[PDB]
Write a protein that binds this ligand. Structure first.
Ligand SMILES: CC(C)(COP(=O)(O)OP(=O)(O)OC[C@H]1O[C@@H](n2cnc3c(N)ncnc32)[C@H](O)[C@@H]1OP(=O)(O)O)[C@@H](O)C(=O)NCCC(=O)NCCS
Lengths: 732, 153
């Protein structure tokens, strides 16, 4: 196997090592030989691997590689037939073969394969567990939408589960319900002698409601609420619903609502609505009990509040009472309340409720002008001095910084929030504008190691969840894995590592991530999933059109194509076609449209075979536009806008790639492009982008709404702009 | 509040809770382990009107001498908007309704010795300090803790 790892890493000693090893021999080495051919040329390799398939390999490693090879060539027929032929030929190894098949198949969420594996495993299987697998896999398939197979899939799963009666636990019962109507679910769950879990209780109540079984549901919910201390709002609503349906009076229901709990106080509103009565008194009663609670507004504002209740906006001592009242009247001018409660009090790790009001005031004031952004940066930092763990203020502070060339200053906030593991997948994008430093590069690699860790942990979770019976949770493990496999946050992480690696001269990381791209081309070219969190900084606020972190999802894909093409050794034309289709529909700024046209012409000239006239046309466009007089359009008219360092960072990376290709593919026209980029650093420095930004900042006047020091922030922002911009200019 | 079973994909929508500075965000494997081994003891609170998670409970059962079992609370947290209305107390009390928990002898938990807040919370729920224990990212785990117990019927 050691010789095989050298072959993978590549490339001439590989064919010799296999020529020697195979000359000693057996099917494995021939599979290797024909992979090495595929690494040289492929039409032979498929014929040769097809030749191997028919010899019925009978060895697990050789089967795995074959099925891997055929799947790599979009030959799903053959990738499955290797295992099926082995199971057919050697049915005593059915379990072992099927589990290897399954463990290797998980990454590729082909529920037809899962169900096919489970079919073989259940035929040569004396296993209740395996029957459950097979049955559950029919539900998985049903979640894909070949509606013409749906009736069959549902009938096969139902009948497999019926074969396992009597049921031994709530997981098996759950699986059965996946193939049942609402009518059947009620009938089944009403006869279960085992105690139901929460999952099945909720399913039982939903079924009764759908069947209009309002006697059975009123009785059932009443049991949960009045005898089993559940105290569940959704269950309370079903209880009053079914109560009315079976003819109970309003008074009959309300007389049982004696405890002044939160859920019952809200329910009284829900009960007025249900009986076409007036909302007012029960809204007032909830407010009197809960106005000192931060929940009050969110609980009431979901109803249509009478204008009389809101009219009590006249003239308080309890801070949270004031917070709710200011929310009810949607008042955005709240510094007066801040001045009365600026001091953090209570538990040290609690946020100060005043900053629910101040954040609303700050968000309403945001107008995207750089003076307004800097002013509100000063206010956020000031609030965070006393309210040190308020995450919403922290997230917004990063968003504001993301509007400027202060790329230095976001990572300390992100890391002070102790983002780790899955939070990187959802919050990553806050680091979009961070500067290409070595410390940031190492942080990004650390983020990538989370991705490596999560990939292996969720795979094992899926294996253990199947081995244990936990069908209640399995679909969520599988979907979690799927959503993580090719997310925009993962690909941004790789794109960002590559960019900083090439801007700095650090080739240590570059070779690992180039190898990821060539390994996962099919994903790089596919559509990415999006699990980013654009909501948490709005929790308890109404989301409005405000400033955004400046993500660019199409550029992320194109960056990965760029690197994939640069390091393509056989045929780049397929990747350039994807590149050109994407740029044709890309939705870019003027500069980004030019950048990726420049990239496209650069890669076509260096990585494809062109006649001399095609070469000259593509190269002439690079020659005319690799000039500061053309590239100045990367400079925004608002010099303080973060787009300046974003575009400049991309220009620097593009020039590094020009130089890389000039080495790997020397030509007179590449040496001329290397020559053309030489004066960029001098020419961009002479534009004095730092000084002009410092002058605009010093000319800005500030009338902050509270007592703050602007000075310390102006200096930190000017120094950060300088450090980040000068690092880029010296890198041209 | 309503209570719902926790599912893995809830992890993607938990930042309002898990960005709290005392609320750890664990590895995928740790969350999934609780869902695999004690799936009923990992549930979430949810609020009207959008079904947003207002908090969650992660608990487990654990065997000793293993002729004698107990339940253990590993994590309770409540979103800031829904604090001081007994939601944490409700999540802890709901354990006592689960038959898997009722079949154990007691519920225990660890509170840091400096967390006078948490001790009182659990004391109000019927827990009492049983024993001080040694300790050894967001929380310094080297700080001593109180194991607190509540005997079950
Ligand atoms: C500790 C925490 C989970 C409590 O949640 P909650 O839903 O607000 O609490 P409850 O309404 O059920 O309150 C119960 C009690 O603990 C205490 N308490 C809870 N939060 C309080 C705070 N910030 N300050 C002073 N006392 C408080 C009380 O003395 C009290 O009872 P009361 O009803 O007579 O006021 C919470 O505020 C938070 O940090 N969530 C997750 C992180 C963490 O610190 N972990 C777990 C607990 S040790």
């Amino acid at each position: 196997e050691i010789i095989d790892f050298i072959d993978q890493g590549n490339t001439y000693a590989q064919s010799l090592i296999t020529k020697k090893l195979a000359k000693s021999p057996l099917f494995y080495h021939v599979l290797q030989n024909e992979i090495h051919l595929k690494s040289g040329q492929r039409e032979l390799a498929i014929k040769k691997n097809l030749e191997l398939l028919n010899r019925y390999p009978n060895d697990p490693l050789t089967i795995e590689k074959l099925s891997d090879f055929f799947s790599k060539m979009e030959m799903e027929k053959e990738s499955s037939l290797v295992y099926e032929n082995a199971i057919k030929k050697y049915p005593v190894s059915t379990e072992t073969l099927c589990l290897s098949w399954f463990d290797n198949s998980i990454e590729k969420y082909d529920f037809k394969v899962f169900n096919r594996i489970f079919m073989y495993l259940n035929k040569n299987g004396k296993s209740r567990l395996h029957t459950l697998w097979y049955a559950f896999s029919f539900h998985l398939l049903l979640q894909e939408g070949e509606t013409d197979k749906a009736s069959l899939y549902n009938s096969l799963g139902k009948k497999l589960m019926e074969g396992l009666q009597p049921f031994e636990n709530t997981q098996e019962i759950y699986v059965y319900t996946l193939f049942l109507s609402s009518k059947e679910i009620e009938q089944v769950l009403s006869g279960v002698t085992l105690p139901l879990d929460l999952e099945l209780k909720l399913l039982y109540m939903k079924a009764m409601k759908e069947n209009a079984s309002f006697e059975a549901l009123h009785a059932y919910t009443e049991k949960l609420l009045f005898k089993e201390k559940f105290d569940d709002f959704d269950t309370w609503k079903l209880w009053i619903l079914s109560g009315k349906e079976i003819g109970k009076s309003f008074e009959e229901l309300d007389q049982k609502l004696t405890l002044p709990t939160r859920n019952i106080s809200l329910l009284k509103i829900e009960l007025d609505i249900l009986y076409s009565r007036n909302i007012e008194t029960s809204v007032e009663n909830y407010y009197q009990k809960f106005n000192t609670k931060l929940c009050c507004y969110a609980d009431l504002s979901q109803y249509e509040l009478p204008t009389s209740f809101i009219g009590s906006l006249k003239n308080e001592e309890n801070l949270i009472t004031v917070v709710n009242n200011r929310k009810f009247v949607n008042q955005t001018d709240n510094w007066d309340v801040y001045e009365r409660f600026s001091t953090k009090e209570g538990a040290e790790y609690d946020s100060n409720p005043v900053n629910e009001l101040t954040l609303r005031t700050i968000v309403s004031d945001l107008d995207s002008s750089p003076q307004n952004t800097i002013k509100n940066i000063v206010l956020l930092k000031h609030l965070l001095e006393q309210d040190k763990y308020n995450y919403k203020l922290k997230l917004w502070l990063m968003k504001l910084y993301s509007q400027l060339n202060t790329n230095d200053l976001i990572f300390p906030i992100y890391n002070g929030l102790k983002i780790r593991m899955t939070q990187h997948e959802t919050l990553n994008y806050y680091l979009t504008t961070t500067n290409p430093s070595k410390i940031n590069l190492d942080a990004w690699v650390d983020i990538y190691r989370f991705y490596l860790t999560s990939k292996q942990e969720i795979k094992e979770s899926i294996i253990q969840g199947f081995d244990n019976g936990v069908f209640n949770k399995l679909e969520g493990f599988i979907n979690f894995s799927k959503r993580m496999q090719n997310s925009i946050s993962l690909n941004f992480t790789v794109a960002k590592i590559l960019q900083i690696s090439t801007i700095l001269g650090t080739d240590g990381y570059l070779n690992y991530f180039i190898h990821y791209l060539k390994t996962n081309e099919a994903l790089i070219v596919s559509d990415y999933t999006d699990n980013r969190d654009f909501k948490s900084e709005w929790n308890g606020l109404e989301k409005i059109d405000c400033i955004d972190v400046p993500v660019n999802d199409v550029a992320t894909k194109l960056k990965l194509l760029v690197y994939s093409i640069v390091f393509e050794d056989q045929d780049a034309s397929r990747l350039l076609k994807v590149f050109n289709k994407i740029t044709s529909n890309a939705k870019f700024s003027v500069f980004d449209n030019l950048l990726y046209k420049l990239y496209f012409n650069l890669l076509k000239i260096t990585k494809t075979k062109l006649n001399p006239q095609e070469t000259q046309s593509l190269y002439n466009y690079l020659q005319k536009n690799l000039k500061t007089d053309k590239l100045k359009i990367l400079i925004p008219e608002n010099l303080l806008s973060g787009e300046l360092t974003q575009n400049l960072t991309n220009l620097v990376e593009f020039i590094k790639i020009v130089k890389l290709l000039a080495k790997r593919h020397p030509s007179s026209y590449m040496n001329q492009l290397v020559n053309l980029v030489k004066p960029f650093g001098k020419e961009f420095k002479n534009l004095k982008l730092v000084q002009r930004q410092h002058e605009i900042i010093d000319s800005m006047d500030f009338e902050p709404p509270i007592s703050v020091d602007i000075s310390q922030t102006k200096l930190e922002i000017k120094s950060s702009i300088e450090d980040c911009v000068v690092a880029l200019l010296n890198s041209l | 509040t309503s209570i719902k079973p926790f599912q893995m994909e809830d992890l993607f929508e938990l930042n309002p809770v898990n960005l709290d500075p005392l609320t750890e965000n664990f590895n995928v494997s740790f969350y999934s382990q609780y869902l695999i081994e004690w799936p009923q003891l990992f549930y979430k609170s949810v609020e009207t009107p959008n079904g947003q998670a207002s908090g969650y409970m992660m608990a487990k059962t654990e065997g000793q001498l293993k002729k004698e079992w107990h339940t253990h609370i590993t994590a309770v947290t409540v979103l800031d908007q829904y604090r001081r209305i007994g939601l944490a107390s409700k999540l802890c009390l709901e354990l006592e309704n689960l038959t898997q928990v009722k079949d154990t002898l007691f519920i225990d938990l660890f509170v840091k010795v400096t967390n006078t807040l948490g001790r009182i919370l659990y004391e109000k729920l019927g827990y009492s300090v049983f024993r001080r224990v040694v300790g050894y990212n967001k929380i310094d785990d080297s700080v001593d803790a109180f194991d607190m117990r509540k005997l079950l019927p």
